[PDB]
Write a protein that binds this ligand. Sequence first.
Ligand SMILES: Cc1cc2c(cc1C)N(C[C@H](O)[C@H](O)[C@H](O)COP(=O)(O)O)c1[nH]c(=O)[nH]c(=O)c1N2
Ligand SMILES: O=C(O)c1cc(=O)[nH]c(=O)[nH]1
Ligand SMILES: [Cl-]
Ligand SMILES: [Cl-]
Ligand SMILES: [Cl-]
Length: 359
Amino acid sequence: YAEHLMPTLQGLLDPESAHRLAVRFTSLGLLPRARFQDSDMLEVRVLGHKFRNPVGIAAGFDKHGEAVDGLYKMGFGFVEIGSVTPKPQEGNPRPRVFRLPEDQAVINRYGFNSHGLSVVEHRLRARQQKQAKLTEDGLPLGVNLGKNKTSVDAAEDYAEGVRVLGPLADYLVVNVSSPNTAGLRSLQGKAELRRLLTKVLQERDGLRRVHRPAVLVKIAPDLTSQDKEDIASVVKELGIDGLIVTNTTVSRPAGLQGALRSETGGLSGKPLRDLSTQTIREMYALTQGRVPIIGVGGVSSGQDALEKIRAGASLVQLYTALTFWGPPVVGKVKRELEALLKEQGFGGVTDAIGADHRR
Ligand SMILES: Cc1cc2c(cc1C)N(C[C@H](O)[C@H](O)[C@H](O)COP(=O)(O)O)c1[nH]c(=O)[nH]c(=O)c1N2
Ligand SMILES: O=C(O)c1cc(=O)[nH]c(=O)[nH]1
Ligand SMILES: [Cl-]
Ligand SMILES: [Cl-]
Ligand SMILES: [Cl-]
């Protein structure tokens, strides 16, 4: 895979075609069931759920909820689908995703291509009780909500997503951090965020108890210090259940080598890694370690995962590493993380969460 398979599928196909085929293959279960059996050391209890291991698939890989079961088979401890927008929409014109192999990075400007809430609702309903069992067995499901390009009331878009997919999700994500929808990231500002999240939480609280998900906010890696302070304040004021830290970056860190480095879009993978880790670290401090963080950005190894956990993440996610290393990277991250936890004297993941802040 890392050397023998992915280079062929990568070089042979443009990245979007490769992704579509990967989703299809995954959905059909055409991957070996992951051999790595999860150690008890990797179990995490957070967000009202048991997570058999802390390595999830980040939003964007399975935008429309087509490959959830195949992703659990790949070894992910939790699956996040989306972003899902209220109405179907096509996203931006192609090409809209670009590989930067020399940087182990991707730039994407999909623009919330989405089958829409109704289609995803019916897809998740078809496996709703299967998911209930998976969740009880430590394999929760997150649903990441977006807003339509032409929406005239962003908060209502997210409210609709809460109402339609909230009952099918263990947690929901208010994605206010895509770089590829005009104006979306302004919803991270204090006043807009408070109003938006108040409405989202009211809608969530109006769901029946067994259908009431945790609500997390997914934030950018490009926030000012003021933005981060404001988000932390709003999250604590409103009782937001957690943060996902981070989405892709609109920055272009010095040193990128890929020919496509100046394409518009969000940058993911290795050049984002430490920017994301530092955002986790700051958000954990600003929330006094009381707000669960799902850490994401440039995770391709156990060390990458543990750095985010020690910075304050209770769980991590990855996407871009899968595009370069294929399915074996999941077990690799988990095996490496277990080894490092043992080496560094942690009894398990839980003991390592935020450990850097206690040094
Ligand atoms: C092609 C593609 C598409 C998407 C994403 C990424 C990529 C590469 N990401 C962001 C993703 O969830 C994650 O936050 C970043 O990509 C950082 O993680 P990695 O560096 O990829 O492990 C993303 N995030 C989100 O909240 N909703 C989405 O629809 C998408 N779509
Ligand atoms: O659909 C996309 O363009 C997209 C959404 C998002 O939240 N993040 C990202 O990098 N791309
Ligand atoms: Cl329901
Ligand atoms: Cl009722
Ligand atoms: Cl480490």
